[PDB]
Amino acid sequence: ITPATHAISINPATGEQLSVLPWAGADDIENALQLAAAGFRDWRETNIDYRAEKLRDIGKALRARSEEMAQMITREMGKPINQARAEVAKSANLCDWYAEHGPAMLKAEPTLVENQQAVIEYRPLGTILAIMPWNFPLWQVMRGAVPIILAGNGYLLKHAPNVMGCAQLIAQVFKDAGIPQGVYGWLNADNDGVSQMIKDSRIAAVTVTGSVRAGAAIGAQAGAALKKCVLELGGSDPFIVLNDADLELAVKAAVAGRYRNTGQVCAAAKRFIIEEGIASAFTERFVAAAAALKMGDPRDEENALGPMARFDLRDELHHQVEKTLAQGARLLLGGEKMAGAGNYYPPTVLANVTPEMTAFREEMFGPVAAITIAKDAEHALELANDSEFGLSATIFTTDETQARQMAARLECGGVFINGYCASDARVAFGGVKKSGFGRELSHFGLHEFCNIQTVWKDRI
Amino acid sequence: ITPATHAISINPATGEQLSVLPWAGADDIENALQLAAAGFRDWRETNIDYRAEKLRDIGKALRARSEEMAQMITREMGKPINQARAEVAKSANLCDWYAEHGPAMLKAEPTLVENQQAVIEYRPLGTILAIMPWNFPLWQVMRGAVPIILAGNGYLLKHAPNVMGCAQLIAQVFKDAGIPQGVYGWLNADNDGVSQMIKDSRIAAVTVTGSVRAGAAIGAQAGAALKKCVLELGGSDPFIVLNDADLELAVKAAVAGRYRNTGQVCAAAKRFIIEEGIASAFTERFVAAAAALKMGDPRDEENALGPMARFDLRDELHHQVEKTLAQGARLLLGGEKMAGAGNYYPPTVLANVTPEMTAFREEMFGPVAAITIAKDAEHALELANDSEFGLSATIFTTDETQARQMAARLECGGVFINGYCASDARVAFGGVKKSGFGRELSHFGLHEFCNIQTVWKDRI
Ligand SMILES: NC(=O)c1ccc[n+]([C@@H]2O[C@H](COP(=O)([O-])OP(=O)(O)OC[C@H]3O[C@@H](n4cnc5c(N)ncnc54)[C@H](O)[C@@H]3O)[C@@H](O)[C@H]2O)c1
Ligand SMILES: NC(=O)c1ccc[n+]([C@@H]2O[C@H](COP(=O)([O-])OP(=O)(O)OC[C@H]3O[C@@H](n4cnc5c(N)ncnc54)[C@H](O)[C@@H]3O)[C@@H](O)[C@H]2O)c1
């Protein structure tokens, strides 16, 4: 057993090894690609209304294993159990939502060509290779798999190596739903196996949810293979609070946005940018509220935070904290690794964070808030856009006109005005800059992996 | 002067050197990137109706230099002068079309979120680097530049090195129209210069129209730099004729589709796939019609074909003809380089072309038709899909239902039934497989380089 030969699951609350799974071999890869190719060949011929009904079947099979799934999520990566349950319910509802609204988004599109000669058809592309992360082991898979399969594609999952118990359980749910094994499939492939599949003609495109470094490594290969990719990568979302904000609501949303899933959220509020007049009141309220978050065993529902998922990533997070403190930030809360067998890092708040500091320029993928003072709203917008990332953003202010104007100038894919940032089937998700490109959910996730095909009759 | 240090224009009809231009230097690249960034910063703030009026100004300035532009196209790459005039007219009309229909396509999109709390906004992305080919030196630039700039982006053109006279004239047209500095720009960059620009933060995304080899080279770099790209690459379009086809119309469309622009068309009919019962009658009519095409001085309007654009590519095309004849195909017309100072290659027809031959597997980017016999309609579909390419396709048959079913199974981005394949502002354009990914024209070309942004108010 070694990370060079096996995927390994470890409980981050206890440090105990849970399972191992060897990398797929040459024959496993070939068999997966044959099954995927055969599955897509038949699935692409099915009726759209039949596929919608199969989505409802997926939702039912998932709910039927909802607690088994939630406990597996919590066990493998440390998520508080009620958050894992909420992840299951949101994933199941996504099946029903696309079942109801998806088919109409795939209807032929008329054009302005005379005599109704030309229409746009949304054709399936093929089998989509999907590379997914551990922070939402179910939702991240379902977010793409549901629309991708509804559009008549196949989906081939390469999951993160620390949640292969989750991966096998998801496959069992799709099996329970009667989804053919070619249509939803999966492989415990190492990175070289991923490389081989991208080069294989039976993979039509790639979708990646992960870090910036993974997106660049995989995106380069997809381009070299002339395969389209969607990259949903890291974020360092700004959370702007102006002097006229609803301060109580802003702090509630600020705390929820930073510390949900023990801070391990792509679109988490990570860089708090507070106008000078309200900064002292915001900072004091935010520290007190963050300090009231209980942390411990994620099977105990009194805990708002669990351990972080990966011991090496807690080390990396603490290193970023220490560098930021050494650069001149002030420690207001937390900021030390909990001793013991568990991978615990307490709610942490860093103040006097300047744009030159590590916690302002890197993704802080854990329960570490950075607080930066803005001279005014113009400064707050400049601070917000001064980032390699560009996934999402929040603005708190009672001047809705100003909020709308700032939203137009924020370099990110989502802007929440006076509310709680989240993903939702009804709206687009995805960012700009090093957060990547392409859009998921709504009709965007349905169309990203369609062959958009012009059919033009009698052009004479 | 050597192609190692300079871009060189040579008149293919005469062989005379027209112009030379050294590659852009480090200062030139930096200057262009600075002005692109500043131009985009101000351009993104303008009102959509102002930008629509500026598109009309581009169309006016282009029509004012229409004969000068047409003659420059013909002089640098050999296109018959009336096709160059048509290219200018189509490009000017594209400006007016997007001016009229573009703004509504950029309006905010309602969502299913209750109480109208969330909309989808189509924001500008930044400066788009555009890598373009010589076969339509004006239209390829305008096809993307017009919607890209209408959406509030900037456009930085890296044109093919044999048409830098066209590139400079295009820039003069944008100057005549009053397009602000850095909103439209261009550089005579060598391949390393392109690599540098892709890695530069002031390039937001890349669009490529060119060969499969260029798309793989550039696409890999875009992915590694986390830049979205659109790849519009080569084609080897099938042209299927079944026994019940309107034979006279099929032959007319077959000759027009193969030999327009002296065959140098991405979506040209390149692989003719004819059902056995009608193959002899098709082949004899096609040879006779192809033989009736006049070739010569492209400034003379009686000539349907000019010389090929590049002397090295004629050598390459003839090598493809020789290899295919060596593999067992039959030469029915043409098939030898014309003697003299001009780069002329006659209309050529190769028959008994089987799937294993060079003319069936590679893009024949010149006036060479390949004819393959299909046993039946299912064999024809299989033959059509047995290709690395997948740009467009044509089916001729009076059985509309069968044509619609084949269209759904053709692995390509466009299918023309009983008609002449062409690009048009009102429909999507783009392919699958090694022909690339992404879509141009209609609302697709407008949205490819937008930041699709959710704006959600009061999500509490
Ligand atoms: N934008 C989004 O939608 C979104 C959603 C969730 C998480 N994320 C991001 O995910 C990241 C954390 O999750 P992570 O730790 O699993 O990131 P990660 O990149 O290290 O791992 C992501 C996935 O990519 C695979 N992978 C990584 N490198 C690879 C390579 N060279 N070849 C093939 N496969 C490779 C991993 O095995 C894993 O399955 C954070 O940056 C977070 O912001 C983004
Ligand atoms: N799909 C489409 O919309 C479309 C339209 C027109 C032409 N084409 C294709 O264009 C091709 C012919 O034009 P071409 O001969 O100029 O193709 P080409 O690939 O040789 O050159 C295309 C462009 O890419 C640039 N380029 C090539 N390699 C590069 C590299 N490594 N780095 C940076 N830049 C590079 C060239 O300088 C040129 O500007 C044909 O294959 C044709 O089918 C496609």
Residue numbers in the entry:
A (entry chain B), B (entry chain A): 3 to 462
Text taken from the publication that reported this structure:
The NAD(P)+-dependent succinate semialdehyde dehydrogenase (SSADH) Sad is a member of the ALDH superfamily and oxidizes succinate semialdehyde (SSA) to succinate. In microorganisms, SSADHs operate in the degradation of various nitrogen-containing compounds such as putrescine or arginine, where they prevent the accumulation of the toxic SSA intermediate. Our results show that Sad is a surprisingly flexible enzyme that is not only able to detoxify succinate semialdehyde and glutarate semialdehyde but can also functionally substitute erythrose 4-phosphate dehydrogenase in pyridoxal 5′-phosphate (PLP) biosynthesis and glyceraldehyde 3-phosphate dehydrogenase (as well as phosphoglycerate kinase) in glycolysis under physiological conditions. We show that Sad, which primarily functions in the detoxification of succinate semialdehyde in various degradation pathways, does not only accept closely related substrates, but also converts phosphorylated sugars as a side reactivity.
EG2.2s had acquired a non-synonymous substitution in sad, resulting in an amino acid change of Q262R; while EG2.3a, EG2.4a, and EG2.5a were predicted by the breseq pipeline28 to carry amplified genomic regions that encoded sad (~80×). To understand the molecular basis of the improved enzyme activity in the Q262R variant, we solved the crystal structures of both Sad WT and Q262R variants with bound NAD+, as well as in complex with both NAD+ and SSA. The Q262R mutation significantly increased activities on E4P and GAP. Further kinetic investigations revealed that the Q262R substitution had significantly improved the Km of Sad for sugar phosphates. While we were not able to obtain structures with sufficient electron densities for the alternative sugar-phosphate substrates, we manually fitted E4P and GAP based on the NAD+/SSA-bound structures. These analyses showed that the Q262R substitution likely altered the electrostatic charge in the active site to better accommodate the carboxyl group of SSA, and/or the phosphate group of E4P and GAP, explaining the dramatically improved kinetic parameters for the E4P dehydrogenase reaction in Sad. R262 is likely responsible for an improved coordination of the phosphate group of E4P and GAP.
